[PDB]
From Swiss-Prot:
Shown chain mapped onto the complete sequence: 416 to 512 of 870
Domain PDZ: 6-86
Localization terms from the record: Cell membrane; Postsynaptic density; Synapse; Membrane
Top-rank taxon: Eukaryota
Free-text note on domains in this protein's UniProt record: An N-terminally truncated L27 domain is predicted in isoform 2 at positions 1 through 27.
Oligomer status and interactors: Interacts through its PDZ domains with NETO1. Interacts with NOS1/nNOS through second PDZ domain. Interacts with KCNJ2/Kir2.1 (via C-terminus) through one of its PDZ domains. Interacts with KCNJ4, Interacts with FRMPD4 (via C-terminus). Interacts with LRFN1, LRFN2 and LRFN4. Interacts with FASLG. Interacts with KCNJ4. Interacts with ADAM22. Interacts with DGKI (via PDZ-binding motif).
Protein function: Required for perception of chronic pain through NMDA receptor signaling. Regulates surface expression of NMDA receptors in dorsal horn neurons of the spinal cord. Interacts with the cytoplasmic tail of NMDA receptor subunits as well as inward rectifying potassium channels. Involved in regulation of synaptic stability at cholinergic synapses. Part of the postsynaptic protein scaffold of excitatory synapses.
Protein's recorded name: Disks large homolog 2
Assigned protein family: Belongs to the MAGUK family.
Length: 102
């Protein structure tokens, strides 16, 4: 896999400009969506399938969705993220089956 790297964003009128998923069913925290024109987009330094490993020194390896949301939303505007591209893990995540007709 690609090595983790540091990404620094400055929140604005729509926050950091991305969505997270995961932190449930034993899964990591993933970037699911990047808002066109938002800070994440304009930076060019985050993409869908990045795993969020830490936020302002808060370790989100193994974090719940709630813990990750609290770290990201509770942060002030300058957010220092350690992210790692995890395309295969994310692809699996997105294909998981949640409802089955029997």
């Amino acid at each position: 896999s690609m090595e983790p790297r540091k990404v620094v964003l400055h929140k604005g009128s729509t926050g950091l400009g991305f969505n997270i998923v995961g932190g449930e069913d034993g899964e990591g925290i993933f970037v699911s969506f990047i808002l066109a024109g938002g800070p994440a987009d304009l930076s060019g330094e985050l993409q869908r399938g990045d795993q969020i490993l830490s936020v302002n020194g808060i370790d989100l390896r193994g974090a719940s969705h709630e813990q990750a949301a609290a770290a990201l939303k509770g942060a002030g505007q300058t957010v220092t993220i350690i992210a790692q591209y995890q395309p295969e893990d994310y692809a699996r995540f997105e294909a998981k089956i949640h409802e089955t007709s029997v």
